[PDB]
Amino acid sequence: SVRAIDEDCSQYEPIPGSQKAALGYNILTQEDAQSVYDASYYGGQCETVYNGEWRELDDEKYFRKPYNFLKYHFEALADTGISSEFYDNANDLLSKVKKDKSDSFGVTIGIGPAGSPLLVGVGVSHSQDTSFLNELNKYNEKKFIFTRIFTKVQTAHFKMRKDDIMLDEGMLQSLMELPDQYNYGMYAKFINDYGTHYITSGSMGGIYEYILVIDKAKMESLXXXXXXXXXXXXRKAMAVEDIISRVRGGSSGYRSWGRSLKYNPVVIDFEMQPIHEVLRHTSLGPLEAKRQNLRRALDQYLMA
Numbered sequence: 001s002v003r004a005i006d007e008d009c010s011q012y013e014p015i016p017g018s019q020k021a022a023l024g025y026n027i028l029t030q031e032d033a034q035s036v037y038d039a040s041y042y043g044g045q046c047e048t049v050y051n052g053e054w055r056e057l058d059d060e061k062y063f064r065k066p067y068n069f070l071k072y073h074f075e076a077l078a079d080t081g082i083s084s085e086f087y088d089n090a091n092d093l094l095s096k097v098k099k100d101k102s103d104s105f106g107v108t109i110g111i112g113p114a115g116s117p118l119l120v121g122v123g124v125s126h127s128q129d130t131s132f133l134n135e136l137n138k139y140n141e142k143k144f145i146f147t148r149i150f151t152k153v154q155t156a157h158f159k160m161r162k163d164d165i166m167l168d169e170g171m172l173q174s175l176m177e178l179p180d181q182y183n184y185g186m187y188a189k190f191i192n193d194y195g196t197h198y199i200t201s202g203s204m205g206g207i208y209e210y211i212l213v214i215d216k217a218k219m220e221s222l223x224x225x226x227x228x229x230x231x232x233x234x235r236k237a238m239a240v241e242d243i244i245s246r247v248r249g250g251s252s253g254y255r256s257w258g259r260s261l262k263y264n265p266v267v268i269d270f271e272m273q274p275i276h277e278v279l280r281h282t283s284l285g286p287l288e289a290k291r292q293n294l295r296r297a298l299d300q301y302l303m304a
C-alpha cells in the first residue's frame, strides 16, 4: 500500500531485515560487509507492507519498505532437514551437509540469475564455522555417532531494485576517493570494507541447528533417538550425550525463535552480484572508469 503525502510515515517501523539486506557480502570469508544500498532511503514516499501476523507481537499491522526494496512480502515457509540419520564423524557430517545434501539442509548463495545456488551450511563466517566446529569436535573417544536436525524458516521474500539504486552515502564517498589509475591495494581495501558481492534478492528467515551425540555401544543395548528428539521440538537417560545447537535469527525472550524470527531475521537463500555491478547502471557518470579497476581488483582478489 502506498500512503500519500499527508499521512506521516514515521508511524511505520522499517521492514524487518532491511539493514541486513543492504550489507555487502564477502564470498571468500563468508562474512557480511558494510552497507552497499542505502537502507533508509525512502524516495520521498511512504510504501507500506502488511503483516498479517500482527496479533502475535493501521500502523501496528504495516511496516515501511525502503525504496531499494522493489518487493518484500511476508511468508511462513518451513524446511526441516532431519538428516539421513547415522554418521561416523562430526566433520564428515558438516562437510557432507554442504557438498552432499539438498537445499533444505542449509542456506544458499547464488551468483546472478541462472547461477546455480551453492549450499553454505548455516551461513555464518568461515571463522564462526571453525568455532562451532572446534568447540563441537571436543567430545568423542574415537569418532562414534552423530545425527542432525536442521530447520529453515522463511519469513519474507524480497527483491532489490536493479535500476536507479540509491547507494549507501559512505560507500559512494569511498568510491569517489579511489584513484582513477589502478592501484590494487586501494581497491582491495574497498573490497574488504564493502564486499565481494551485494544481494539482489532472497528470503528473510533463519535456521535452528541440532546435533545429537550418541554412544554406539549404548543404543546397541537399549535414527531412533533422532525420530524421538524431533518430537521434543515439534539430561536424563537415553544415551543423551548432549544435543548441541546453533541458531541464526530471532532473539531471546528457544522455540521463542519461531515466534520472534519474522521480526529479527537474517538473509538466507539469496542471490548476489559482484560488487562492481552495483555501479553499472544507477546514475553517477564520472565514476565509470573506476569500475574497470574495481572489476580488475575483484578478479585478482578472488584468485588468491
Ligand code: NI
Binding pocket: 073, 075, 157
Ligand atoms: Ni513469496
